[PDB]
Amino acid sequence: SNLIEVFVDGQSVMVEPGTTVLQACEKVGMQIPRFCYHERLSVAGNCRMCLVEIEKAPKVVAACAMPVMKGWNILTNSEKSKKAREGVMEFLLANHPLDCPICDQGGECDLQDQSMMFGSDRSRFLEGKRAVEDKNIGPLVKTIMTRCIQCTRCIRFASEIAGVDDLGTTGRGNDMQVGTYIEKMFMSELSGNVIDICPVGALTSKPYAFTARPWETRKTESIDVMDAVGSNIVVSTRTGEVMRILPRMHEDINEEWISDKTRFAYDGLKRQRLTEPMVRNEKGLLTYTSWEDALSRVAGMLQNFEGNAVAAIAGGLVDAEALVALKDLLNKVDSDNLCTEEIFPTEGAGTDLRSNYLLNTTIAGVEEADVVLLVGTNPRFEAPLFNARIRKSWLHNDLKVALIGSPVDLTYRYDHLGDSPKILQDIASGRHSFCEVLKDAKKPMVVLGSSALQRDDGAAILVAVSNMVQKIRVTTGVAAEWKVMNILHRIASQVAALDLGYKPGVEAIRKNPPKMLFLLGADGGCITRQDLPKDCFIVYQGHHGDVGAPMADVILPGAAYTEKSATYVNTEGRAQQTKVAVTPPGLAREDWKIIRALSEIAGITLPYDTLDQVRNRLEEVSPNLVRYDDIEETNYFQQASELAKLVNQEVLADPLVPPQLTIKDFYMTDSISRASQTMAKCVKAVT
Amino acid sequence: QLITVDEKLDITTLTGVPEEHIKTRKVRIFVPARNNMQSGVNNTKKWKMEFDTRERWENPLMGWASTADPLSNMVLTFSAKEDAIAFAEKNGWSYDVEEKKVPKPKSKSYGANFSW
Amino acid sequence: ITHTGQVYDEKDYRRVRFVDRQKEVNENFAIDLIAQQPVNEVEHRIIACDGGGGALGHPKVYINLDKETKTGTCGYCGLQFKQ
């Protein structure tokens, strides 16, 4: 018990040695007014707006940097610590430009409040204010930096979370301006977080410039579907259209940060969006028609076609509830050709034991690892808020990162073992140098990005990695609950698909062409009318008209994750629930119901008729979909290896390369993104 | 006196709520999350019970947002999971409790950034 | 068409409204009236812009006409100032 005892205005709390004075007040429950101190950012002491008075002490101390000592009673509401705030707030406000009705961080200001609660009723600054020169930091951040309180949060985030040290302070005195010395845009993922982290409205979001004002925004808590980290987010909706998506904190998944894609592609959600159910008509043009007519177009073809003549290529952002409603339907006409666009090697236990296909070590385990051998992925642009995880654990802890992929910008110092899938065999043999490095690791982890598995020798690549994980585990003698093998995805509806029993890859549809295909939100080119039977009856089930719509005999519009109470699951199997922020547009309907209804018109009606019932259905297919925010550990790995050992495959010499080589690759990757005007502006800025 | 009864005190029939707004409607007990835009933690301390989001459409004449969900602007505020589950069960609504998410303790030190 | 679009598409049934009636539309677009104004030349690096008034104009903000490259524009009046 190394607790040390310290008094918060008397509550006499006991705290670990090394907790800051500000932290001591927090556990009692008091809040020190603070600027320039963020929990996951280094203490800087720039503002000194947190001056408090420990007891019988000569001067005020900075609650952000003073380690509380033994038996110091903090007096947070003394007559002194209020003159130490009534007089600081005098200064921050003195050089501040009064354009609060321009500053769109109007009600979202941590500087008006603290002025309005702890600061002063009046002003004594009868002199002249200063002005700085607005510069361009990008097409996402509007830096009206005459607002800046030189709190250096931005500089730190830019250097400690995102590894992009482009921002910095220049000059001394009252014209220290915290902007890039040369005008180089702040181009990085994790970029938009600066907005959320600058308490002042100096730099704010340019798309959401002046569309709203925070008191009005109704805030619904939901889940990120753009990437497979499944970052928690809050969708701010006003009068029924989404106005902004900002992060909400999840310790394990996104701890207060969200990607540039899943914050500025809410605009893409509002155009090129399907709404009414069109049906090919006349010469072939698609013609808007009522559900009844469009549904029976599909139902009639479904009754005519038998099993293995009906197939589904789902993929992208479809929810688990639709995925079970599409499987239950196509099995009621006996085709189990349901498939996903992202090919996960099934030449093994395959989709059968989750240990196989789930980051086993959780995102939060990256903090406890000792060496990570990333093979096949550019975590940065595939799963950015997991790249950050390895960013923090390489800085605050000591992770030794090794990449077997293309040498790529990783925001940290990795070891480039090489660009060849066969050198995986080199480490398994113990031939390559890093073989000992791992031998030295007590808690190692290996990450294989699905983006590799998508090549032709992906089955061989998974088997080769499983062999190395096997002897890495044997040589290290790592404990059982520590799990070395994990694989990260880049498609939101993959893990759930795989769990619900959907077989990955369109390989099965390729060998026998289905008379009728019900593409379920699939905008990928995995099959085309060109590769289908002459009949080629195909019906798109989705939200945005992109690739599957113009080659579709029927259009059954659906919703998006802002518009339905569906479930998703990220890579380590944590199921999460999207909440309806806005009602779905036009005649468009929830994905699960379209398929329950088509089944009623077809006559093979599905059992559930309300969503709680579909949640009960999910419980039957895979039981850890009905369970939210819980990661389950049963590492059925040992048996996975046995089947891997049976599988014999050749890893071709072609280097394994992540598709998202540089950030322009990243911006536009999905229907809701490829339709983004903001993403498009970002794409041309890079090009 | 002191009669004994064994119900979950369903006052669903004393409340006066039209059936369809007591049957097909899910309350979501949760402690509101912080506005990333600010760092004040005073709006993440009391458990709220908000209802499902139904249609918010457009008034043809002026373009305003219109609605038919009488229980749309409803955000009852409780002080503990226990007291929110009780009210929902009391009124006959379906609930989706979400556990609180207090930040864990993260150790912060000024000197640390000076090491080399 | 209003300064902010709004023009109804010919097919829009929302056009009956104006039958035997008309459409309230302001002819004085502020996008152009403000452009029909002389860039306020100044000597000082920074200048104020009370909105041409004290308490009868807009909150007073100081604009940095520091780069001839850009004429500072008070976010309230849209007045460009030429260093």
């Binding site: 090129q272 069109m278 072939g284 013609t287 | 457009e58 | 009636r21």
Partner: peptide, 27 residues
Amino acid sequence: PATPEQYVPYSTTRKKIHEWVPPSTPY
């Protein structure tokens, strides 16, 4: 120091949504 000019309201909003326009020629 009966009239036709009657105020009529709008939705001065720029329509806030965009539907996919179906492909012009068949496949």
